[PDB]
């Protein structure tokens, strides 16, 4: 099966550089027209730039927004293809994908025939996370949203960088369970909501934890909700 | 620098209807320079149509491409569940660029949305920063309007709001809007007051909160 498969992505400060690969397989590379599109958090495909190529001269194209800091370039020899982020700006984070189009070849027979085919296969790599901010890493202060149908939540501030998890009573309780997308705050850092409706005659019989884990820094919360 | 645009921005269908989704151009793309894709959250795009008209491999039949020139189109038959997604027209002619993309959604019935609000936590404040929380519940249309009032006081650009994706239980949104405040400004003031508007609710809708109590 024809896959991509993108890394290098990580986190940069403004203005730091970065260095993409990209590997492919199961196609003649040297024929294949590279491309690198990115998507920011929330928004759409953005094409970003492309080389043609090695056979038809490999020229290359650019986004006008990352001409003159990304270079792309080439390893046939490897299946490799590159992209070198300069001069990094926070408005280039986001998920970063490898993709061409490429031909593949369908054989069937009959007892009275055999047919020879080939086809276009379009294919994307998994894409790499590119975070470019000046924030410091840092796990998330957890605050209870108190209740008193009922609704009870807690509260994930300040946090850096992506992802953070929430479970609830570990993972028992998931229906009626909302964990709203973080939003980016004017300190750089993420904040983010997780709420949950219950029965209001369950706020005095049962306690809700909701369980909060943030790898990049090893925390930890089991933060107890209460009326 | 052809530029593409997409009609809608969210296209609001039931499953089992057809849909029609728009791109065009600000100059003319050639038959066999344009494309469609599909992207459902967390997923890479999926190829479904290329040169305007040929479905790719592995694609249903209900998937269709038609246009020339700066007007095309995508048709979907019969929208399945797996088909409520992002769609994206792309060029590659002379430009290489992507369209802004089109979700469609489920149609559901309008839902009013239960309204809630939460005020600091007492740990949160001794840290010398507030925020108070409201949170609009499992409504339908996404269309909602939270409108924080501080003692009657109509705040302005000390919110950020959050929308879920589409439910993919009940077709859904959700919406949490937060206010933020210094422990200075939160402890000077009463009536922190939420008002929602949305199209299933007659009446505007506050949910509110005495600092005291």
């Known amino acids: 099966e024809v896959q991509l498969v993108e890394s290098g992505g990580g986190l940069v400060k403004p203005g730091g550089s970065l260095r993409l690969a990209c590997v492919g397989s199961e196609f003649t590379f040297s024929e294949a027209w590279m491309t690198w599109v990115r998507q920011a958090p929330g928004k759409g495909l953005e094409w970003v730039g492309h080389m043609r190529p090695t056979t038809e001269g490999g020229a290359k194209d650019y986004a006008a927004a990352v001409r003159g800091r990304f270079t792309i370039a080439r390893d046939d020899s490897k299946s490799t293809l590159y992209l070198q982020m300069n001069s990094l700006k926070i408005e280039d984070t986001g998920v970063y994908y490898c993709?061409?189009?490429?031909?593949?070849?369908?054989?069937?027979?009959?007892?009275?025939?055999?047919?020879?085919?080939?086809?276009?296969?379009?294919?994307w790599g998994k894409g790499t996370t590119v975070t470019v901010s000046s924030a410091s890493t840092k796990g998330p202060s957890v605050f209870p949203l108190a209740p008193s149908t009922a609704a009870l939540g807690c509260l994930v501030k300040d946090y850096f960088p992506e992802p953070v998890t929430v479970s609830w009573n570990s993972g028992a309780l998931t229906s009626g369970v909302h964990t709203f997308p973080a939003v980016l705050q004017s300190s750089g850092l993420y904040s983010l909501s997780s709420v949950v409706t219950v029965p209001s005659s369950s706020l005095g019989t049962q306690t809700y934890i909701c369980n909060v884990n943030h790898k990049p820094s090893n925390t930890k919360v089991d933060k107890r909700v209460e009326p | 620098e052809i530029v593409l645009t997409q009609s809608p921005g969210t296209l609001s269908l039931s499953p089992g209807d057809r849909a029609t989704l728009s791109c065009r151009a600000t100059?003319?793309?050639?038959?066999?320079?344009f494309a469609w894709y599909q992207q459902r959250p967390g997923q890479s795009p999926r190829l479904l149509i290329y040169?305007?008209?040929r479905r790719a491999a592995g694609i249903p039949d209900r998937f269709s491409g038609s246009g020339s020139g700066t007007d095309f189109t995508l048709t979907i038959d019969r929208l399945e569940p797996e088909d409520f997604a992002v769609y994206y027209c792309?060029?590659?002619?002379?430009?290489?660029?992507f369209g802004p993309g089109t979700k469609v959604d489920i149609k559901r019935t309008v839902a009013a949305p239960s309204v809630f609000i939460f005020p600091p936590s007492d740990e949160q404040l001794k840290s010398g920063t507030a925020s108070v929380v409201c949170l609009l519940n499992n409504f339908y249309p996404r269309e909602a309007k939270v409108q924080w009032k501080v003692d009657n006081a109509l705040q302005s650009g000390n919110s950020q709001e959050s929308v879920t994706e589409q439910d993919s239980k009940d077709s859904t949104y959700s919406l949490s809007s937060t206010l933020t405040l210094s422990k200075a400004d939160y402890e000077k003031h009463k009536v922190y007051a939420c008002e929602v508007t949305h199209q299933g609710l007659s009446s505007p809708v506050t949910k509110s909160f005495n600092r005291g109590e």
């Open positions: 792309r060029q590659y002619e002379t430009s290489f660029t």
């Open positions: 993709m061409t189009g490429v031909e593949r070849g369908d054989f069937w027979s009959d007892d009275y025939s055999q047919h020879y085919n080939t086809y276009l296969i379009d294919v």
């Open positions: 040169g305007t008209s």
């Open positions: 100059q003319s793309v050639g038959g066999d320079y």
